[PDB]
Amino acid sequence: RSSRAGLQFPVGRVHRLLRKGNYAERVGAGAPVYMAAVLEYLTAEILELAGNAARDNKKTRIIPRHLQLAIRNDEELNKLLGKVTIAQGGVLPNIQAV
Amino acid sequence: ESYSVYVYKVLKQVHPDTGISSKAMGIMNSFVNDIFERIAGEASRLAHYNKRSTITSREIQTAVRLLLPGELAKHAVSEGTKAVTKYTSS
């Protein structure tokens, strides 16, 4: 099911999660496909900015610091993850000019 | 709860040579499990509000448009509508 949509995220596992999570009495057929396409796109969007931040720091691996640096430097992802604490992520370097 | 394989696999097609720390993927698992429960709670609400008993790609579309900001919604909806078109294509 994941291969037909051209996805990498598990459509079947999203289906089972939706059915077990008692979100509705019934779950459709394109609902897991749409949800997996949404989660995978967001994952790829974070994993690109964090990974660009890894080259900007001359690293070959991604650490919580890079994920935080990517999320807070993107207005949309910062608004989305605005009330989210990222462990071992630090803060954005910023000093006021008084 | 664990999306580690798929976060690894999406990583390889955006940054083939870059790795992920154990703590960095223990964080993306939290991100995926958080945004999934965000969309599935808004879509659950959107079905009750219309006295509807099934969650469809329409409700996922509307929940994504309500939760995701600005151009994230425009680009996530355009990918959800493209994966369903391909899912149900002969």
Binding site: E45 | V10, H15, H75
Partner: peptide, 7 residues
């Protein structure tokens, strides 16, 4: 052809 985002 790395997968990039058009955002």
């Amino acid at each position: 052809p790395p997968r990039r985002s058009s955002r």
